[PDB]
Amino acid sequence: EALRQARKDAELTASADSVRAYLKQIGKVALLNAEEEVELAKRI
DNA sequence: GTATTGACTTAAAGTCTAACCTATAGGATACTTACCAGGGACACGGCG
Numbered sequence: 001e002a003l004r005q006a007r008k009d010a011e012l013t014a015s016a017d018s019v020r021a022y023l024k025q026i027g028k029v030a031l032l033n034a035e036e037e038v039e040l041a042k043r044i
Numbered sequence: 045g046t047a048t049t050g051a052c053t054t055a056a057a058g059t060c061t062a063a064c065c066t067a068t069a070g071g072a073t074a075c076t077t078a079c080c081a082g083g084g085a086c087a088c089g090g091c092g
Contacts, residue, residue, distance in 0.1 A: 023077045031076060 015021050032040070 017079095019078065025077095027077050 015024065
């Protein structure tokens, strides 16, 4: 509950440091596995 | 001294050929979030 509000408040922060901001934005998307890779490549 | 021609050799190109740089591509086990001051003035967010 309070932890949830804390996490949300955190997500709305700049962190100034541009490396820090990019390192934050790259973690949004999860990784994949082999079958996901092959289906994705087939789509491409 | 100042008017010439006929050779006689020479550096500077002008060019063809060869090697030595240069722009570029590629590489398939798997690896997935880096790292001691003060002193004054002005502006922004909270609280009453």
